[PDB]
């Protein structure tokens, strides 16, 4: 998806040049077509670890003081769901 973001940047240069050349037809085709469509595509392409968040804080306050405060990280939920067994 990194190339497509750069591709989104390439589309922005394309809309720049469409408007340079008087290409109204491409102006909106990029403003309401290519650029926004690649943008929704890239929003979909977002996988999730490049900035601290409201869960690393919980991780630290769990490692320290031992009290578990998290989000039931996909392994604890299955186990908690069958306890009376």
């Amino acid at each position: 998806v990194r190339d497509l973001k750069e591709q989104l940047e390439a589309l922005r240069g394309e809309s720049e040049r469409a408007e340079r050349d008087g290409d109204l037809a491409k102006a909106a085709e990029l403003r309401y077509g290519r650029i926004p469509e690649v943008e929704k595509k890239l929003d979909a392409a977002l996988p999730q670890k490049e900035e601290v968040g409201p869960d690393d804080i919980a991780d630290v306050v769990s490692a320290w003081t031992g009290i578990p405060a998290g989000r039931l990280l996909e392994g604890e939920t299955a186990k908690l769901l069958r306890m009376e067994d």
Binding site: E19, G22, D23, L24, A25, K26, A27, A28, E29, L30, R31, Y32, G33
Partner: protein
């Protein structure tokens, strides 16, 4: 060649014709179009486009693009273009330097002299302004031939020796002039002149674009006033619809994607125009031509039958709305044909040049 040329520096149609051994050759600009659009777009650089390059920046350098400084020649019509204020002579001199190097390219050497024209509604202050621009750009107006006069030259309308009556309808894209011409002995008088110095076939195009966005909002409700490139596109498509419906009864115009629609769908354009609706649309712009001609008539007191030639100059008199109101008011008198109306006055001014050369 004639060592000089002629220049119908239109109000929107700056054209220059040379003489291939007397053959009136309208030189293709380095822009390709023999007509340089008489627009000077002081791009936000200090650099200055001219022609369709400038025309394109009529929306972008709207704050720095000059049109119809032709009308403002006779003053210090001095436009604060980045550095200082550039008077109408220099704005004209820019187009003249373009045309200069276009012809130098077309030649292989800078054969530069000219016969550059004025509307018959102009005054000798505008002509002094052109004298200064000639001191500036480096082309010679060895003499000015007013535009109706160079029209009657261009079509070779040397009728009766004692005197001849030449009617001339100039509609450049940005200028209108009715003129009546008593000519004789190779000496010319534009006997009378009226017109509409604000009207032009690009005023016609502006009415067109008005309607365009009118029915755009008629169906959906978006204004291309809201989009500058859309205004450029409407204007360009409208003038090329002008030269289209100078031959075509009707021209359908269409554009892919432009702005979002009501349902957030990239809206476009698609529909017919019928030239009937066009002459309906310029109808008050056609009233802006009639009583001008009534005024030139009364100035001359001449019957349209007595007129010995009629003439169509300025590219927007390719239009048959022009020729319709001609043959209506002129009693059916056919204007003489053989040169493009933009080319006409440039051609005949060039003929005057060769008459000098």
């Amino acid at each position: 060649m004639a060592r000089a040329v002629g220049i119908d520096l239109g109000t929107t149609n700056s054209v220059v014709s040379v003489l291939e051994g007397g053959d009136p050759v309208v030189v293709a600009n380095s822009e390709g179009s023999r007509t340089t659009p008489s627009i000077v777009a002081f791009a936000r650089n200090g650099e200055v486009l001219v022609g369709q390059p400038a025309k394109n920046q009529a929306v972008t350098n709207v704050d720095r693009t000059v049109r119809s400084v032709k009308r403002h020649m006779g003053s210090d019509w001095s436009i604060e273009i980045d550095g200082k204020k550039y008077t109408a002579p220099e704005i004209s001199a820019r187009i003249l330097m373009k045309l200069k190097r276009d012809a130098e390219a077309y030649l292989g050497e800078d054969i530069t002299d000219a016969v550059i024209t004025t509307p018959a509604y102009f005054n000798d202050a505008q002509r002094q302004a052109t004298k200064d621009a000639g001191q500036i750009a480096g082309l010679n107006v060895l003499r000015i031939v007013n535009e109706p006069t160079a029209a009657a030259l261009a079509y070779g309308l040397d009728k009766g020796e004692k005197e001849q009556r030449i009617l001339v309808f100039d509609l450049g894209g940005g200028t209108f002039d009715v003129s009546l011409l008593e000519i004789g002995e190779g000496v010319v008088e534009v006997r009378a002149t009226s017109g509409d110095n604000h009207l032009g076939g690009d005023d016609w195009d502006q009415r067109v674009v008005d309607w365009l966005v009118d029915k755009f909002k008629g169906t959906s409700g978006i204004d291309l006033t809201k989009d500058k490139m859309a205004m450029q596109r409407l204007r360009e498509a409208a003038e090329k619809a002008k030269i289209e419906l100078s031959s075509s009864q009707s021209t359908s115009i269409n554009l892919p994607y432009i702005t979002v629609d009501a349902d957030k769908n990239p809206l476009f354009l698609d529909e017919q125009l019928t030239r009937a609706e066009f002459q309906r649309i310029t109808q008050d712009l056609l009233d802006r031509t009639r009583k001008p001609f009534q005024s030139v008539i009364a100035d001359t007191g001449i019957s349209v039958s007595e007129i010995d030639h009629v003439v169509l100059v300025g590219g927007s008199t390719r239009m048959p709305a022009v020729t319709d109101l001609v043959k209506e008011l002129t009693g059916g008198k056919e204007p003489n044909k053989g040169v493009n109306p933009d080319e006409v006055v440039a051609v005949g001014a060039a003929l005057q040049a060769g008459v000098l050369k």
